[model samples]
Target: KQIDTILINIGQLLTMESSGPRAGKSMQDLHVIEDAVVGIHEQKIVFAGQKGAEAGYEADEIIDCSGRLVTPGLVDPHTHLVFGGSREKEMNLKLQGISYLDILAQGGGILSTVKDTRAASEEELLQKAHFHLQRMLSYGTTTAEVKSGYGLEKETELKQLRVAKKLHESQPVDLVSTFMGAHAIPPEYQNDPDDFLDQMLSLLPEIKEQELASFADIFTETGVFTVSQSRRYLQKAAEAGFGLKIHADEIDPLGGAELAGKLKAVSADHLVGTSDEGIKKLAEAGTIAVLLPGTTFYLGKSTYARARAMIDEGVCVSLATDFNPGSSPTENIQLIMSIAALHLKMTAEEIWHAVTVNAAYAIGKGEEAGQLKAGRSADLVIWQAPNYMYIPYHYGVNHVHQVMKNGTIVVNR
Candidate 1:
């Protein structure tokens, strides 16, 4: 059969099996095919197997892969990718041993960005976020979950989501937007958080009606929204027909993970202080654990999420950049993969699954966006190296040579 394109001479094809997020030892299997060929037609994978088996597939364009590596495009399940400003100035405070919560309390962390995001016009916000999306594409990220928390108010929160929606419609990288007005306590509502909660809840119906965001997220931590407040807000969000996500246990071991389990939220992110009991609850609820190690590395902290334990205990674990202004200020999934290896103690195979199939599940794109198997979306990356292991090993550099999104070559470096 004739296809739109065929990538030939692939040295290694790191294809993930079409399963809903792998756990424990199953992540060790990446379903690798040596000397593989991939065929695409109408933006769908038609075949991905050894080269000799594709004698039946003719193509309009046959691009040789130069004996490099190929795999499904990377998926970033959690990121604050749409914002108006950068937090480079916070480096000095961090070096001075000021903590994240302290910086927030000083009105220099997320709140600072909120002011900038609120002040920026929609066109300006779109311009900045579009640049971020371009950088992500160069890093092999084809799909990402971008959140709208930098705007703690109604208008700015809606503005951030609107920019994310525009980027999704006008770009190669697919984006899933999450409503996160509960990300922090705005300065105006510092004294009356409940009133702020009420206002945020009012926007849920409008957000749902406008189809602005798919998931609603909250910062459930100490000095932030309490677990009870998180519950009330998430329940209202669920009632308004949005999927649930929680910023659980980042700076404190609150019962946010247990809450995530009880609510059966789609994912519980930033579990730096997650407890063993929380791991059990996540396993029971089948909630995806979206771990962000980059944040820990950036914050100069030693407490990374218990990825090894979570995987061993039957909890499906995924990795993300948490790409925001103050924490984890990187769009490079390759760098995050290396961090997972050294800090999280995750093997290359497990890390591969975390960024690919498992991360896809975290963003509600498990079936279509993650794997390179037949019938999956033809979103893939061709690396400049020989195999998957080399990517993390050759860290601190962009390893991607070409990126294909929806059967079209979008980035060829």
Candidate 2:
């Protein structure tokens, strides 16, 4: 048999088996194969395992990994990737000990980005997002979810989602769109939150018809929508045929996680302030807890999500960059690796699962490209390190030597 390409001299090949989204103790095992060889044909993996077995295959191209690490391409499940402007000016306020909700109250946080996003053209947003996508790819993130929350209104929200769609079509990195019109209460509806919710709900049919987004996400926090309001919006979104997700318990433990469980949202994000009861609800409902340590780090918060407890309680967990202008401004999941290890106390294996397989499930992309399995797309990263531990162990640098998507080397640095 002949294949298009063969990766040789892989010191550690992490074939995160495509069984299901990892949970509990399952994340501890990376299923490593030393001295591995992977064969790719027609943009799909034909074989990936130990090198010594009598595997007979001729290859058109041989990629020498130089005894380095190889694993599935990184997936970032939660990012505000289509925003228009930067928020570097807010750093001073953060340094002054202004809380996130306090900043929101001062009309600075997400609302400021809403003003910028509404002002920018779709083409401008597309170009900016494409630049970020390239940066993400250079750091080995091949797939990411970009949300439409910066635009809390109908036109701008759809504009952001359309830009996300265009970026997905034009770029090497895969982009998943989420409708997050309920991210904040726009100033126009500041006095009428329910009216804004009703208006955002009305846009769902058009979103569905245009196929702009697959998931509907709402920020259910103290300064944002309440639990009942989130429920009403998400229920209508489900009826409109969209998968559900929630921005829950980031700054306040307002039963957002419990509501996520009752609604069975695909994943509840930003559990910085989630209570023990919320953790139990997530585990019982089998909802993936997408933790964002980068946000906590950026905000200079002391406490992170209880990743250890979440894993111990048999809950599937994932880590994301939460790339945005205000809080987490990095496009690097490598940075997230270090944050999760140091702050979240996740082991190397657990962190790997969070970025790859479990993160894939968070965005409803479980079977597509998370694992290096036969019949799956050959999307993977070749690291400059010897093993997976080096990724989280040696922090604050891009360890990716190359990234291959669909059997083609997309980024080499």
Candidate 3:
């Protein structure tokens, strides 16, 4: 059969074959089809294997990738890309020996961004977000999850979600919107945190009615929303038909991961202090454990995510940039993978699964995207490398030569 597109003579094709310790096993055991070719029809992969096996296939357009690596486009499952303002000054304060909590107490950190984000107009916010989304795409990310937490008020919170919606509509990359009204308690409700919770609860129906968010997220921690509060909020959001995710166990072991497993959240991010019991529960519940190494590295914290332990416990691990202004301000997944391999002690293969298929599961889009199997979305990247390991080995460099989103070449080196 004549295919819509054929990329032949590939030097190496990394297919994250479904196997290994991760859930979806999606590409955990990568199968390298050497000197292979891939056939695509419409926007889905039609064939992928030995060139001889695909020799019978015809194509309307042929790309001769004689010495390049082709694999699924990277997925960043956690990010806060829609907020306004920067926290470079606060970052400087931290470098100068100030604690994060101390800065937040002085009207810095997330609240600082929240103040600026609430002040910006929708158009301004969207314009700023466009640049960030473009940067992510340029770095080979074809899909990402963007959260709205800086705008805690109903009006501004909805505005941030609206920007996230517009980003999806305007960009070629798939954007997942998350309503994170519980990201932090606004200053107005600092003395009466319940009032902030009430505000968020009242807005849920409207947000869901508009289909503005796919998942509802909360910062469940000591200085942020508590585990009990998260259960209440997540339960209500779940009843309203929204998937759940949590910024859990980032600062301390507040039972955020345990609660996430109990509530069956899609993923729990930033588990810098998660316990063994919590990891076991998350593994048992099949919840994706998204590790944001960039956040720890950016904050100069020595503690890394429990990636080795999670893998040993058979927990599905995913990695993300945690792209935000205050902490991890970069959208470089390649660098994140390098950090995972070197600092977190994950194998290059595991990091590949973490960013591709496992990351897709983190955002509740497991089957629709991620992977290079036949009948899957042709969101693929052509690498300027001889093998997959070079992706992390070359660290801090852009090795992506071309990007195809839905079978259309959107980025070219």
Candidate 4:
């Protein structure tokens, strides 16, 4: 059988690799190749280099990206995008110096979303989630990890994961599901968080048996699941054949990162209050430090995630839109990248790497989906920019001209 071919004449190609002292540097360290053309066969990249050198090869389709740049499609490693209800009112309260804890005290936060999510039917959740997923795709997110924290109960948690599975089956993009059943303690279990955790543990075996999630996550904080309880739950979840991720140290230094490193979890997110020792431990463990700047920005706080320090300390950093109802309410990964660059002091290349290759590693899909290399999944993004820097430079604008997922053009300009 003859292989399908797509020859893209990109004005500039940003390959995120380097040698010597810059070997471990972020995407900003990648040097640009001008007048480049990429050849795709079947669903993988066959050749990528200068146009004239590759002109000798034949092609089935030719795409003239005369004034654009091509890069790997963005991967959002952490997002709570599959829930019901909106939180704009709470957002306004947060902007007025009302703390998140304060709002949660008054019947808001994840619990609020939980109420609405449980009340809505599965079809309703799917429809709402599809809109968010489609919006994310429009911003060049080819892959996303959606969590199931909004449904804190057994039936409701399963319902949310089911919606996530249906969305993946019906969509053109890749969706990874995570069971974040320990996201928070419900009002009923306010007195005994351990009992709530026990309830969560009871459901894990069944959730795993049904293959409802690829990962297990817990929010380890002061008022939520404590460090000790989080450790126990995450260990049990890991034993059930699920990878580990945690919402740690967002509000206080609760040793969440330290415990996560000890467990050798896949990633530890938030870390606004992470100590220097915690960062070192995470670096030593080779755990990806996933940052969510949108949450802090929306909460009107100045505690942005430490992207530069994490990267400089030999830690792989990933960026994501936290996309929860109470904290971050949108699924715009591009806007999150912009926030990382402008507020977190990350360079354009580092931001790009965070959302792509690094983010993929955080979600345990690093080798196959994050890069446009040989034998990998055919997920690529063509941007209407001269170079990679323009991605974050032209913030809040749709620069993605074309999107190809699994070797097909899902979104064309």
lDDT of each: 0.91, 0.91, 0.87, 0.82
Question: Where is the poorest 10-residue window by lDDT in model 4?
Answer: 15-24
Model 4 lDDT per residue over 45-114, tens place: 7766667745557777777887689887889999998888887767577667777887877778878898
Question: In model 4, where do residues sit more than 4 Å from their true spots?
Answer: 17-28, 52-56
Pairs with backbone N, CA or C atoms under 3 Å apart (clashes), candidate 2: none
Candidate 4, after superposition: displacement of residue 291 in Å?
0.6
Model 3 CA deviation exceeding 4 Å by range: 19-28
lDDT, model 1: 0.91
Over 309-392, each residue of candidate 3 has an lDDT whose tens digit, in order, gives 887887899999999998899989999999998888888888888998788888977886678878988999999997998898
Q: Residue 220 deviation, candidate 2, in Å?
A: 0.7
| Candidate 1 residue lDDT tens string, 21-102 | 8877888876888999999999999988998767887899898998999999999999998887788988999899998999
Which 10-residue window in model 3 sums to the lowest lDDT? 19-28
